[PDB]
């Protein structure tokens, strides 16, 4: 009931290990620990035979491009989570940071494996020949530009966009497409394991991000000002435009049976809005009813392909 006249912020350095000022951190690290997985657990022989014999060119190309798109984010040094303790110098945030950073290396190794297995290393090296990918790199570079900023307001902006776009949305259309092959045609089961496990991880990273944004809300409510909220709204809008066009490239050899572009676009718009609600920001798209239930099977399939 009694608010403190003064207190240390999330940006100040607590030196003693415990007790944790932000104990909820452990919900996120324990969820990752519990879901722990590596790609070496998985053999893709069945999936390659499925690919070889039973997928059309349109389908093969959807799989290939969805994986190139995931790899574009995942097969990289992703230094954000490893860097958060530099901004929030708490023992608990070193633990969250380190936990999510190690997870992202399990990710990079997993998608690197799928590229070698499916024979797409050449296409990955030249991926910047695709116009829409170069535009994805641009919107990603705008999210990431204030990642290492000493200016805390700007960094907070990077974090918001990092969490709602890169962790919560940018990959999820590709995840859905790959999962559709298993849900609707029983093919690519092992690939869908990797994807389901990554989906679970990325949701936890996004929610961890959201937790941190909400703590900054409480301590520095002045930060969520008019310009900043509008700066976020606009960047999101643009980003969704690029990811819609990513779909057009993924399905370049034609539309397929197991999933449709329009459903995916409303799936993305929807999950953006939900993430916005969760950090008390006004919705952008306001999707339906009943569009976004086209892909309401997503979570069920994710839960199912985690074994």
């Amino acid at each position: 009931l009694v608010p403190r006249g003064s207190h240390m912020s999330i940006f100040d350095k607590r030196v003693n290990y415990k007790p944790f000022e932000y104990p909820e951190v452990l919900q996120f690290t324990e969820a990752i620990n519990k879901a722990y997985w590596v790609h070496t657990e998985v053999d893709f022989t069945a999936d390659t035979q499925d690919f070889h014999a039973h997928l059309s060119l349109a389908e093969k190309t959807a799989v290939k491009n969805s994986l190139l798109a995931i790899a574009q984010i995942e097969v990289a040094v992703k230094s954000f989570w490893g860097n958060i303790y530099e901004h929030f110098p708490k023992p608990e945030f070193n633990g969250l940071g380190s936990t999510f950073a190690e997870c992202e290396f399990r990710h990079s190794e997993a998608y690197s494996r799928l590229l070698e297995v499916l024979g797409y290393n050449d296409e990955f090296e030249k991926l910047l020949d695709v116009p829409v990918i170069r535009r994805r790199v641009d919107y990603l570079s705008n999210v990431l530009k204030d990642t290492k900023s000493q200016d805390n307001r700007k960094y907070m902006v990077s974090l918001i966009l990092f969490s709602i776009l890169i962790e919560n949305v940018s990959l999820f259309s590709q995840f859905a497409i790959l999962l559709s092959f298993t849900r609707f045609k029983g093919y690519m089961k092992n690939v869908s394991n990797i994807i389901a496990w990554t989906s679970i991880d990325e949701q936890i990273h996004a929610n961890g991000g959201i937790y941190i944004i909400n703590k900054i809300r409480e301590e520095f409510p002045d930060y969520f000002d008019e310009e900043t909220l509008a700066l976020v709204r606009e960047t999101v809008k643009d980003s969704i435009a690029v990811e819609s066009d990513i779909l057009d490239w993924i399905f370049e050899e034609g539309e397929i049976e197991s999933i449709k572009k329009g459903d995916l676009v409303n799936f993305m718009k929807f999950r953006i809005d939900e993430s916005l609600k969760q950090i008390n920001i006004p919705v952008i798209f306001d999707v339906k009813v009943e569009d976004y239930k086209a892909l309401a099977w997503f979570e069920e399939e994710v839960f199912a392909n985690s074994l």
Binding site: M8, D12, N16
Partner: peptide
């Protein structure tokens, strides 16, 4: 700022 708290 560096500090302790229990």
């Amino acid at each position: 700022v560096e500090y302790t708290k229990h």
